Each structure stands twice: as structure tokens, then as C-alpha cells.
């Protein structure tokens, strides 16, 4: 449902740039002239709609247009809009006829939305805004990613003659990699439920399709087998996505030039630990718990003492069932996949023993024992506790002491005491979370030990599947980390666009002094610079006795004045603050920041786990340092991960897939314009258009220019005496363009967009005596085209007409 | 099956039945023949059919592949914004222009029966007439 | 004496998506598909909301029954008419033709036999045959 906060932010993104040319030199309205506007009862009444199409009426005035809405259908009523509420319209263009948004005459917001929409309603869900690929979730199987479409995009001689697709990106990336021996990274971003993980798997399947076999099938099978396993352990049903990834995924892959994955390496970061302890309503925990409890056979349930999905504290008893999701069939696939990852049957039984032990431990109840206030395991549940630790291959007595016995330092003396109930529950809970997270990461380390190359990667295909910018009502620490990640990726995007444009200008002799670059250096620094940043002061406060959320906030406001990018909050300034992210201000709540940042199992508990006699459980925490140090802080560990990850990505040629969720109802063919526009903005699709249009954005070879612009000055263009490069100079000099509107390169004519549009009108003016001939030829062919489309559906029509005449008899 | 024979006998003359009467029967039996079906049996047997050929004709007219999805194709083709609706005028022009065109009055009567509103869920219109 | 009403009617609903009214831009294409050309004055004189009956009457009055595609090639004028095929395609592209390359192949399918130099009288004749 469209929130009034969503209408508010969507209307801030809305801008009006170019002027509407509704009048001729006479001052009369062009007969039938069409515009977009955001003023319409249709728009007040339907929150899915932000603009409507109207005809300007004979008699309007330049300062106040009189218009009548035509699409969606209206009343015929004239009404008046200020020109700043009218937008040019691409009235006669077929949106299916080309793949990039920037080929439209007008790329204002209502025009962009309408172009994507009509493509999408025809199931063409992929569109470019170079270098971006836009992918709109169709919420149905379109049939466009089968093996037959892989083979089509792979084996077609000229793939640029196919429509945009994620396979176009997979092919062009693999081709460059093998073409110039350069690593590549495909970066897939977007909000929850937009389609990033599906896109990722589609691309993976393309890369796994070899023209003539893969001798390393064993390793490819393990890599592909990991998708259901990573989804089971790391994905959960939320309100926005029945299959929400609750981690970011980075992969490296080695792929033969004809297809087939030969090596790989997987990385998961930012796992939502809290999900395993509690879940909002209508939401589940990680799929694996439900797969396991419903899918385990009677011998495994009896062995582990398993109860039903509705009988575990850690599992929301009311959301256990997800429509369209068969957890039993999913479990069978997970068990098959673990085998394909070269885990033995014994290995797999340990894995699910640990899973059953975490669940069982969650069901152990504690009580307040007062004789100071101490905690104890309810005597009724002591056996449940012991079975939980047995299932985890953990020492039951030592695990007990760590949850119940406290050691405090007062003065400079160690004083044994007792955790109270609340604290002991936190400790029991943190053991559950830590065991689950380390088991996930252990499964990945096992996978990597089977698929990685011995000596590291020479050249590799990267793939990142991560949350895009997130702006929620309550933004917390998890959102901060996500939005820092996306500032790093934004920079990767603006840098590669600049690098590539600068290189082309230089290779062609054109001056780069006119090139623009929108740095986000200041905001990255305010977030990450050592000593002078939010992450620096979150760390300091964590490492300080008597640190507080509010002191963290306070220390930030006082020390980060020298840049606008930090802004204290007007409302509740004590525990809230605002960052000026590239996509706009985002408000975070520091409440619990220090808590969440310290939520890492440390200390003697980790040493009890490492002492397990079971080899897998010993490895869960392998090599962890004994202990509060910053090496145990989520924010400090996260920034190390991020920096390492971006150094790797920045060493590659990036590709950007930007996924869009078109409505919040998981439905096909439903288009919510305010939600989509908000995503156009947060994905930098509108910005990518701007960036590309700037400067001398039109380039063509001398003979391309001449094939395109012969009739600007047909004389100069058909002079055999003068050379091609010199013909272009002649034509351009005689055209009337200002010197500022074009430059001649080594091999190309550079034009500003405005310059190319003028030259197009100039050529048409020189051809005015063909206007009527071409108009009639065109219209007559279009009528033929429209009739052929009808003829396809006539057999169907006969069936409708036939049944009508049947019902007539039956009456 | 006896309905088959009974209806034939009401329309038979000299053991043979005219194609127009065979199509009328076939509709009484709940089949929906079209000019394509009538052209098929004309190519084989001319304009008057023996009982055996009348049964063969009823075979041609079964059209099991008929379903809401196959019938709506032409209406969906003109539904550019994908609303699922067309006005009555749109569906009237379609039914009265192409194919085994209905007369204007036949098209109106069929639309006005199914609904009294100008905009018609054409998926439901086709489901209604498929019964 | 040759009645075009049926052709005029079909064409209208092809360009209007089967509605009894048509947008001004689509009306220009419709009339252009029958060789009809209006001055900017005659254009401004038109109704703002053109319906079927309006178009059927305008078409009778404006269609050139003797020379439907006069504005491609006029037989009254002694044009002796023959221009280069790639220039033709250039002019079409200069004037922002909505014809896709497939359509331009459609155009060349209808009007070209052999890869010759294209004759506009051939164009006009071929389109006249396809009305
Ligand atoms: N290309 C697609 N084609 C068909 N269905 C899709 C497609 N992409 C996503 N979906 C549907 O949307 C759901 C969520 O997509 P997902 O990739 O998990 O989103 P994200 O990973 O961005 O959070 C999928 O489970 C699927 O139902
Ligand atoms: Mg995902």
C-alpha cells in the first residue's frame, strides 16, 4: 500500500527540466499536442499513478495551459495547469523498438516511467541506461531464462541484435575477460524482493552452460549446489520477500570461454544473527529450520528428539507456513545439495545435530533463584539442556557454568558471582546465534575448500548480490553498514564512468577539461575515515568503559562539523542523527548501537566450543583470539571485510544490474509509479542518464556521420575531392552549429546532444519536399503492420464468435 | 448420444442433413462450430451429409483446446494498458469487423446480456460464453 | 463506382484500438495511410474529438479514388521518379520514420522485386494494390 511518506519522498525526486513546445511561431497550439502532467483527479484517487497524459487545447496561453486528459480515460473536461506542471511527451515512439532509455527524445521522469512500463507490460523487463542494466521483477515465470534462451544469447552471432537481458551482461563480461585478460565483476543491487538473487542464479546458469562439456563438472556441480544450501541457511520469509536473502554474497568464478565453471570461491557477510532468536509477526526464521523439522524422517526425529515447527521458542509459532513453499521438497534438495558439496553422510548428520541442538537449547527455560538474584535452569528442563549440549557436541557442565556463573573485576580483583535471569538468557541466546552463524560460515569454508584453485585466482569473474540503499522509518546499525557499502559501490560506478569517458576523449584528442565528476568522497570519509568518522567513534565508544549510545552520538556531532555530511537530528537529537548519503538524507537511530556492535560471542564460552571432541564443532570458531578488543567488534570487522572486498572489485571491470520491484503485492503486471520512481532514484538510473548526456555525448565515425547527415549539406557530402574527415568539417561549418557544439577527433565527430538534435532538424528541413511522400509511405506500412497483428489473433476470435452463436441457440 | 440422433432426425431429409442444420444441432449439443469447421466438411462431403458424416462433423466441432486463455487473445491484443477491461464499443467493433463477424445487433445483445456496465472484464465474458 | 466505407472503418479501429474515437495524432496517421494530406490550416479546422462517423465522411471527401497515392507519384505530372535505394532509406531515417528495419524490409518486400534505384511509381502502385 502506498504510504503518504512514499508520496512525499516520490514528489521530491520529481523535477521539471526542459520546456514544452506546445505553440508554433504564430503562437497557436500545435493541433493535438500531448504532454504529461501530475495534476489530475486520476492521481488524487489512485496512488499507483503519478502522471497522466493530456492534450493541450486550442487557445491555451504560454503561461497557463488548458489541457484535457486522454490517458487514462477521463471526462473531456478542460482544466488549467501552470507550465511547470507539464512535461514533454514521447508521443509516437514504440518503446519496444530499442533497448536504452537515452535514445528517447525526452528522458524526463514521466517519459522514463512510461517507457519502462510499456516494455514491462509486454514482458520486456530489461532496459539499459548505459552502463546500467535495469531489471524489473515480473513476479511470474516469463520463460525468458530457459536453456533455450541461454543458448540463444550465447550462440547468436551478434547479440546486440537481441533485446537487453541479464545474459547480455553475462556474455559481454565473459567476452571481455577472455578478450583482454581482465577480471570482471557483476554487481546486482536493489531493494528487498526486487529480484537480485534470481538474476544472480540466472547468470550463474548461463556461465555453467558449456557449448561442449565441462571436465570440471564436479566443481561446477558443487558451486551450483550451494545455491539451495545458502538460501536455506541464510534466507528467510519476510513481509517483503518470501525468500529474502539475509546476508550479502560475493563470489569469484573461473569460467571457460565456451562456458563451464572450473573454480570458484564464496563469501557471505552481514548475516542477520538476531533472526534466529525472534521474528516479527508474519515472518519466519531461516528456511532450514522449517525444512528440517518438517522434512526429517522418523529415525532422524527420534534420534534428535525433534518436535514440531510450532513447538520451538525460537520459531514464531504462527508463521510456519509460506504459500507456494514446500519445505519438505526443499529439504530433500538441500540434503542432495550438501552431498554434491562433498559432505559425507556423517558430516551432514553433524550439521543437523547442531541445528537440532540450537533449537533445543532455545527451549530451555531459566528462572530467578533468590536466596543476590541468580539464574538457574528450570529443573524440569535440565534434561532438555543436556540433550541440547549433546546435540552440539558440547560439554554440558562447562556450558552451564558459562551461562550461570559470572566473573566481574572490582577494584583490581576477580570476583565470582552469578548472572541474573535476564543476563543469563542473553548468554544462552548469544550461544544459539553464534553457533548458527559459525555453522553457516563453516559450510561455506568447506565448500571453498573443494572449489577454490590451489594458487589463488589469476583472472576471475566476480559477482556481488547485495542490498541496495535502504531508507526505513527506523534505520539501525544494520542499515548503516548496508548504506556505507553502497557509498563504496556508488564510487565504483562514478569512477568507471569518468575513467571510460576520459579515456575516449584522450584517445580521440578531445579536451577533458569539460568533464564532470560528482564525488562522494566527503560522505565516505564522514562514515569511515579513521579517527574522524562515525565508524571510528562507534568503535571508540564500544572500547570505552561507560560508553553509551548518546555519548557516541554526542562525540560524533561535536567532531564532524567540518563537513555537511553529518547532521544532528532536530527531533530527539540525543540518540538520532542524519547522514547526507548520495541519494539524500537518511536518519539513523543510535539506540542499541553499542549493544549490536558488541554482539559477538567471546571469552571462555568460545574456548569450551573449541574443546568439543567433534572435529566440525572444533572448527566453528577455529583460530578466534581469546578475550573487549576491536577485533571482536562487528563494525571494525565489517570495515576490514568491506575494504578488502572493494580492493578486489576495484581491480575489475564492473557491470551493474539494478533491480526494481514494481509493486509491494508480489503481483505481475501491476505498476506502482511512486514506488518505482523512488527506486529509479535510489539506483542512480535517472543520474546515469544525466551523466551520459553531458558534454560531447554523441560520437560517430566520419563515415557514420556522413551516412547519417548526408543531406545537411548534400553538396559537401558528395564531393569526391575532399576526404571523409574533411567533409565532416565542411558540413558542420556550413550547418550553423556553434563551434562549442562539436569537436572533430582522430576518427570521430563529437557532438553535444543539443548539437545533434539541431543537426537532425537541419537535415529534415533540407528534405521538406519528401515530408508528404514519407508520411504516406510510413502510415500505409503501419496500417499493414497493424493488420498483420490482428490476423494472428483471428483464429482465437473465431472461437469467441462461435461460442456466442452457440449461446444464441441455447435461448 | 441419443440427443445426437434425435436432433439429426428433426432436421433430416432423405437421410442427409444440411450443413446449416448440422451446425445448428452441434450448438444444441453445446458445441461451437465456425466457418473453418463448415469449410472442412464441405471439402469432404459437399453440402449434405449422411448420418456417418454428420457424426464426423460433430467430431471436428469439439475444440477441446478452447479455454479462457485461447479465446481472449484478440481482446487482450487491444488492451494496451493491460487493465483486463475493454469498453462495449471496443468489443463490438472487434466482433463485427473480423472473423465470422457478428452483426451489430448480435454483438450488442451478447455484451448487454453479460453486463450492464460499459467496461467489460473480457476474461469473464469469455468464461461466461464458454459454458 | 467503388465503395471504401468498409476499408475506412477497419482502418480507423486499427489506429484507434477499436474505440469509436481517435486521438488527433493517430488520426493524422490514419488519413495518411490512405494518401490524404492536410494543410496546417485544414488541420486546425478539424474537431478536437474525432469519431468514426466524422472520419468516414472526411475520407469520402478527401480520398483520391483515382490516384490514392498521388503524393508518392502523380501520373498527371511527367516525372519520367527513380532514386537510389540507400538514399531512399536515408531520407526515411532523416525524417524520423517509425518504420523499424523489419518494416523497411516490409516496405521493400511490397515495393522491391530485385535489388535495383527504386521507382516511386512502383511504390505507389504496390501500396495501391495492398489497400
Ligand atoms: N526474473 C524473475 N523472474 C520471475 N520471478 C522473479 C524474478 N526475479 C524475482 N522473482 C520473484 O521475486 C521473488 C524475490 O526475488 P529475489 O531475487 O529473491 O529478490 P531479492 O534477492 O532482490 O531480495 C522471487 O522469489 C521470485 O518469486
Ligand atoms: Mg536476495
Q: How far apart are CA A81 and CA A62, in angstroms?
A: 11
Q: What is the dihedral of CA A150, A156, A160, A165, to 10 degrees?
A: -10
Rounded to 5°, the CA angle A277-A280-A286 comes to 50
Measured from the CB, is residue A227 less than 6 Å from ligand 1?
A: no
CATH top-level class of A478-652? mainly alpha
Measured from the CB, is residue A234 less than 6 Å from ligand 1?
A: no
Measured from the CB, is residue A192 less than 6 Å from ligand 1?
A: yes
Q: How far apart are CA B44 and CA B54, in angstroms?
A: 12
Q: How far apart are CA A688 and CA A593, in angstroms?
A: 34
Q: How far apart are CA B106 and CA A805, in angstroms?
A: 9
Q: Which of B18, B35, B66 is the last residue of a domain?
A: B66
Chains contacting chain B through 3 or more C-beta pairs under 8 A: A, C
Measured from the CB, is residue A235 less than 6 Å from ligand 1?
A: no
Positive or negative torsion for Cα A20, A21, A23, A26? positive
Closest CA to A87 of A39, A25, A32: A39
Task: Count the Cβ atoms, other than its own, within 10 Å of residue A371.
Answer: 5
Which residues from chain A sit within 8 angstroms of residue B31, using beta carbons?
Answer: 806
Task: Count the Cβ atoms, other than its own, within 10 Å of residue A627.
Answer: 12
Q: What residues pair up with A184 in beta bridges, in sequence order?
A: A461, A653
Check CB contact of C20 with chain B, cutoff 8 Å: yes
Is B97's CB within 8 Å of C9's CB?
A: yes
Task: Report the gap between the CA of B24 and the closest CA in chain C (Å).
Answer: 29
Closest CA to C118 of C66, C73, C67: C73
Rounded to 5°, the CA angle A254-A256-A261 comes to 50
Which residues from chain C sit within 8 angstroms of residue B80, using beta carbons?
Answer: 17
Task: Decide if A717 contacts A731 (C-beta within 8 A).
Answer: yes
Which residues from chain B sit within 8 angstroms of residue A796, using beta carbons?
Answer: 70-74
Which residues from chain B sit within 8 angstroms of residue A69, using beta carbons?
Answer: none
Same domain, B51 and B72: no
DSSP class of A514: G
Q: How was this structure determined?
A: X-ray
Measured from the CB, is residue A581 less than 6 Å from ligand 1?
A: no
Which residues from chain A sit within 8 angstroms of residue C90, using beta carbons?
Answer: 707, 710-711
Task: Decide if A166 contacts A133 (C-beta within 8 A).
Answer: yes
Q: What residues pair up with A252 in beta bridges, in sequence order?
A: A265, A462
Check CB contact of C92 with chain B, cutoff 8 Å: no
Same domain, B51 and B95: no
Measured from the CB, is residue A193 less than 6 Å from ligand 1?
A: yes
Give every CB contact of residue B29 below 8 A, 6+ residues apart in sequence.
B3, B4, B7, B58
Q: CB pairs below 8 Å between B and C: how many?
A: 21
Residue A71 corresponds to which cell in the numbers above?
Answer: 490517458
Residue A432 corresponds to which cell in the numbers above?
Answer: 544459539
| Residue having the nearest C-alpha atom to atom 8 of ligand 1 | A195
Q: Which of B66, B87, B102 is the last residue of a domain?
A: B66
Same domain, B130 and B80: yes
Task: Report the gap between the CA of C131 and the closest CA in chain B (Å).
Answer: 16
Same domain, B76 and B31: no
Total count of domains within chain B: 2
Same domain, B62 and B80: no
Is A767's CB within 8 Å of C94's CB?
A: yes
Q: How far apart are CA A718 and CA A788, in angstroms?
A: 40
| A766 φ, ψ (degrees, to nearest 5) | -70, -10
Domain boundaries, position B79: 67-131
Domains contained in chain C, CATH given: 5-62 (1.10.238), 82-129 (no CATH)
Q: How far apart are CA B43 and CA C117, in angstroms?
A: 47
Helix (H, G, I), strand (E, B) or coil at A749: strand
Q: How far apart are CA B25 and CA A731, in angstroms?
A: 76
Task: Decide if A135 contacts A659 (C-beta within 8 A).
Answer: yes
Task: Decide if A699 contacts A749 (C-beta within 8 A).
Answer: yes
Q: Which of B66, B87, B121 is the last residue of a domain?
A: B66
Check CB contact of A30 with chain C, cutoff 8 Å: no
Same domain, B73 and B43: no
Positive or negative torsion for Cα A483, A489, A494, A497? negative
Rounded to 5°, the CA angle A720-A726-A732 comes to 110
Task: Report the gap between the CA of B36 and the closest CA in chain C (Å).
Answer: 22
In the structure, ligand 2 is a single-atom ion and the residues with CB under 5 Å from it are A 196-197, 245
Closest CA to A434 of A273, A298, A557: A273
Q: How far apart are CA A667 and CA A685, in angstroms?
A: 23
Helix (H, G, I), strand (E, B) or coil at A432: helix
Which chain B residue shows the shortest CA-CA distance from C12? B93
Residue A748 corresponds to which cell in the numbers above?
Answer: 570521430
Q: Half-sphere exposure (CA, 13 Å, Cβ side) for B15?
A: 3
Q: How far apart are CA A628 and CA B100, in angstroms?
A: 84
| Residue having the nearest C-alpha atom to atom 2 of ligand 1 | A137
Chains contacting chain A through 3 or more C-beta pairs under 8 A: B, C
Task: Decide if A78 contacts A64 (C-beta within 8 A).
Answer: no
Same domain, B49 and B78: no
Q: How far apart are CA A615 and CA A245, in angstroms?
A: 29
Q: How far apart are CA A415 and CA A14, in angstroms?
A: 63
Q: How far apart are CA C97 and CA C87, in angstroms?
A: 14
Q: What angle do helix axes C5-16 and B88-97 make, rounded to 10 degrees? A: 140
Resolution of this structure in Å:
2.0
Tell how many helices (H) and how many strands (E) occur in chain A.
Answer: 30, 24
Check CB contact of B90 with chain C, cutoff 8 Å: yes
Q: How far apart are CA A800 and CA A627, in angstroms?
A: 78
Same domain, B38 and B87: no
Same domain, B14 and B47: yes
Is C10's CB within 8 Å of B97's CB?
A: yes
Closest CA to B18 of B40, B34, B41: B41
Q: How far is the CA of A193 from the centre of ligand 1 (A)?
A: 6
Place of cell 552451564: A400
Same domain, B23 and B37: yes
Closest CA to A429 of A354, A363, A384: A363
| Strand pairing report for A698-701 and A748-751 | antiparallel
Q: How far is the CA of A257 from the centre of ligand 2 (A)?
A: 28
Measured from the CB, is residue A238 less than 6 Å from ligand 1?
A: no
Same domain, B61 and B103: no
Task: Decide if A612 contacts A394 (C-beta within 8 A).
Answer: yes
Cα C32 vs. chain centroid, distance in angstroms? 4
Which whole-number Å values give the CA distances from B18 to A135, A166, B42, B56, in the listed order?
58, 59, 10, 14
Same domain, B42 and B54: yes
Amino acid at each position: 500500500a502506498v504510504t503518504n511518506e512514499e508520496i512525499k519522498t516520490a514528489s521530491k525526486i520529481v523535477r521539471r527540466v526542459s520546456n514544452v513546445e506546445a505553440f508554433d511561431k504564430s503562437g497557436s497550439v500545435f493541433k493535438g499536442y500531448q504532454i504529461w502532467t501530475d495534476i489530475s483527479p486520476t492521481i488524487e484517487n489512485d496512488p499507483n499513478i503519478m502522471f497522466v497524459k493530456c492534450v493541450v487545447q486550442q487557445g491555451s496561453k504560454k503561461e497557463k495551459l488548458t489541457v484535457v486528459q486522454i490517458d487514462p480515460p477521463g471526462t473531456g473536461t478542460p482544466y488549467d495547469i501552470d507550465p511547470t506542471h507539464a512535461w514533454n511527451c514521447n508521443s509516437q515512439v514504440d518503446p519496444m523498438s530499442f533497448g536504452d532509455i537515452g535514445l528517447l527524445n525526452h528522458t524526463n521522469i514521466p517519459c522514463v516511467l512510461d517507457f519502462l512500463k510499456h516494455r514491462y507490460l509486454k514482458n520486456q523487463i530489461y532496459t539499459t541506461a548505459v552502463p546500467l542494466i535495469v531489471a524489473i521483477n515480473p513476479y511470474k515465470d516469463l520463460g525468458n531464462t530457459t536453456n533455450e534462451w541461454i543458448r540463444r544469447y550465447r550462440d547468436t552471432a551478434d547479440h546486440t541484435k537481441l533485446p537487453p537481458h541479464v545474459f547480455t551482461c553475462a556474455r559481454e563480461a565473459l567476452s571481455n575477460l577472455h578478450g583482454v585478460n581482465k577480471s570482471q565483476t557483476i554487481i546486482v543491487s536493489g531493494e528487498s524482493g526486487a529480484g537480485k538473487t534470481e538474476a544472480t542464479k540466472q547468470i550463474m546458469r548461463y556461465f555453467a552452460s558449456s557449448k561442449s562439456g565441462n571436465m570440471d563438472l564436479r566443481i561446477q556441480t558443487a558451486i551450483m549446489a550451494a545455491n539451495p544450501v545458502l538460501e536455506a541457511f541464510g534466507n528467510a520469509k519476510t513481509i517483503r520477500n518470501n525468500n529474502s536473502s539475509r546476508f550479502g554474497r560475493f563470489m569469484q568464478l573461473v569460467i571457460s570461454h565456451e562456458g563451464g565453471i572450473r573454480y570458484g570461491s564464496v563469501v557471505a557477510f552481514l548475516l542477520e544473527k538476531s533472526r534466529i532468536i525472534t521474528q516479527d509477526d508474519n515472518e519466519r526464521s531461516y528456511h532450514i529450520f522449517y525444512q528440517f523439522l518438517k522434512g526429517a524422517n522418523s529415525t532422524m526425529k527420534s534420534k534428535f528428539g525433534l518436535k514440531g515447527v510450532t513447538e520451538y521458542k525460537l520459531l514464531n509459532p504462527n508463521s510456519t507456513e509460506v504459500s507456494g513453499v514446500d519445505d519438505v521438497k526443499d529439504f530433500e534438495e538441500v540434503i542432495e545439495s550438501l552431498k554434491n558439496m562433498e559432505l559425507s553422510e556423517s558430516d551432514i548428520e553433524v550439521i543437523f545435530s547442531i541445528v537440532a541442538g540450537i533449537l533445543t537449547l532455545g527451549n530451555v527455560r531459566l528462572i530467578e533463584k533468590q536466596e543476590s538474584d541468580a539464574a538457574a535452569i528450570m529443573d524440569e528442563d535440565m534434561g532438555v539442556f543436556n540433550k541440547a549440549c549433546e546435540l552440539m557436541y558440547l560439554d554440558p557442565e562447562l556450558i552451564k557454568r558459562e551461562i550461570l556463573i559470572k566473573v566481574t573485576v572490582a577494584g583490581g580483583t576477580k570476583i565470582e558471582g552469578r548472572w541474573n535471569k535476564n543476563d543469563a538468557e542473553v548468554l544462552k541466546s548469544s550461544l544459539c546465534k553464534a553457533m548458527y552463524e559459525k555453522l553457516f560460515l563453516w559450510i561455506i569454508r568447506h565448500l571453498n575448500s573443494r572449489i577454490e584453485p590451489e594458487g589463488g585466482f589469476k583472472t576471475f569473474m566476480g559477482m556481488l548480490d547485495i542490498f541496495g540503499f535502504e531508507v526505513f522509518k527506523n534505520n539501525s546499525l544494520e542499515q548503516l553498514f548496508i548504506n556505507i557499502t553502497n557509498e563504496m559501490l556508488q564510487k565504483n560506478f562514478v569512477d568507471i564512468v569518468f575513467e571510460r569517458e576520459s579515456k575516449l576523449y584522450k584517445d580521440e584528442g578531445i579536451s577533458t577539461a569539460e568533464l564532470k565528476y560528482t564525488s562522494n568522497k566527503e560522505v565516505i570519509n564522514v562514515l569511515c575515515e579513521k579517527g574522524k568518522s562515525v565508524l571510528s567513534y562507534l568503535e571508540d565508544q564500544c572500547l570505552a568503559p561507560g560508553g553509551t549510545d548518546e555519548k557516541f552520538v554526542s562525540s560524533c556531532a561535536t567532531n564532524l562539523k567540518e563537513n555537511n555530511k553529518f547532521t544532528p537530528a532536530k527531533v530527539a537529537s540525543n540518540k538520532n542523527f542524519i547522514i547526507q548519503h548520495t541519494i539524500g538524507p537518511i536518519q539513523y537511530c543510535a539506540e542499541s548501537f553499542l549493544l549490536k556492535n558488541k554482539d559477538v560471542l567471546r571469552g571462555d564460552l568460545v574456548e569450551v566450543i573449541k574443546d568439543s571432541p567433534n572435529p566440525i564443532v572444533q572448527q566453528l570458531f577455529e583460530g578466534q583470539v581469546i578475550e573487549i578488543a576491536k577485533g571482536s567488534l562487528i563494525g571494525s570487522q565489517f570495515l576490514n571485510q568491506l575494504t578488502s572486498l572493494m580492493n578486489l572489485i576495484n581491480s575489475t571491470e564492473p557491470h551493474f544490474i539494478r533491480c526494481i520491484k514494481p509493486n509491494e503485492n508480489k503481483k505481475p503486471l501491476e505498476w506502482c509509479e511512486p514506488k518505482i520512481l523512488i527506486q529509479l532514484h535510489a539506483l542512480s538510473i535517472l543520474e546515469a542518464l544525466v551523466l551520459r548526456q553531458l558534454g560531447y555525448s554523441y560520437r560517430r565515425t566520419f563515415e557514420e556521420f556522413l551516412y547519417q547527415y548526408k543531406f545537411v549539406d548534400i553538396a559537401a557530402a558528395e564531393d569526391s575531392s575532399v576526404e571523409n574527415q574533411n567533409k565532416c568539417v565542411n558540413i558542420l561549418k556550413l550547418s550553423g552549429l556553434s563551434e562549442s557544439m562539436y569537436k572533430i577527433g582522430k576518427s570521430m565527430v563529437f557532438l553535444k546532444q543539443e548539437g545533434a538534435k539541431i543537426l537532425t532538424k537541419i537535415q529534415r528541413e533540407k528534405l521538406v519536399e519528401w515530408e508528404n511522400c514519407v508520411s504516406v509511405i510510413e502510415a500505409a506500412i503501419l496500417k499493414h503492420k497493424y493488420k498483420q497483428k490482428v490476423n494472428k489473433n483471428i483464429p482465437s476470435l473465431l472461437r469467441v464468435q462461435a461460442h456466442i452463436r452457440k449461446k444464441m441457440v441455447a435461448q | 448420444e441419443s440427443d445426437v440422433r434425435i436432433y439429426f432426425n428433426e432436421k433430416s431429409s432423405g437421410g442427409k442433413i444440411s450443413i446449416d442444420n448440422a451446425s445448428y444441432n452441434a450448438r444444441k449439443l453445446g458445441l461451437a462450430p465456425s466457418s473453418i469447421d463448415e469449410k472442412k466438411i464441405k471439402e469432404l462431403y459437399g453440402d449434405n451429409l449422411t448420418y456417418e458424416q454428420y457424426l464426423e462433423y460433430l467430431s471436428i466441432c469439439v475444440h477441446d483446446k478452447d479455454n479462457v486463455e485461447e479465446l481472449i487473445k484478440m481482446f487482450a491484443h487491444f488492451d494496451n494498458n493491460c487493465t483486463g477491461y475493454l469498453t462495449k464499443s471496443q468489443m463490438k467493433n472487434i466482433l463485427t469487423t473480423w472473423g465470422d463477424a457478428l452483426t451489430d445487433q448480435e454483438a450488442i445483445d451478447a455484451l448487454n446480456a453479460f453486463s450492464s456496465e460499459d467496461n467489460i472484464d473480457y476474461k469473464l465474458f469469455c468464461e461466461d460464453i464458454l459454458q | 463506382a467503388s465503395d471504401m466505407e468498409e476499408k475506412f472503418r477497419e482502418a480507423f479501429i486499427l489506429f484507434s484500438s477499436c474505440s469509436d474515437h481517435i486521438e488527433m495524432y493517430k488520426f493524422f496517421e490514419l488519413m495518411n495511410s490512405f494518401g490524404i494530406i492536410l494543410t496546417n490550416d485544414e488541420k486546425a479546422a478539424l474537431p478536437n474529438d474525432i469519431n468514426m462517423d466524422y472520419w468516414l465522411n472526411f475520407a469520402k471527401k478527401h480520398y483520391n479514388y483515382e490516384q490514392p497515392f498521388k503524393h508518392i507519384n502523380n501520373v498527371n505530372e511527367q516525372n519520367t521518379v527513380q532514386i537510389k535505394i540507400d538514399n531512399f532509406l536515408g531520407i526515411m531515417k532523416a525524417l524520423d520514420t517509425r518504420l523499424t528495419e523489419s518494416d523497411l524490409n516490409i516496405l521493400l518486400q511490397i515495393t522491391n522485386p530485385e535489388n535495383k534505384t527504386l521507382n516511386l511509381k512502383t511504390v505507389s502502385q504496390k501500396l495501391t494494390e495492398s489497400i
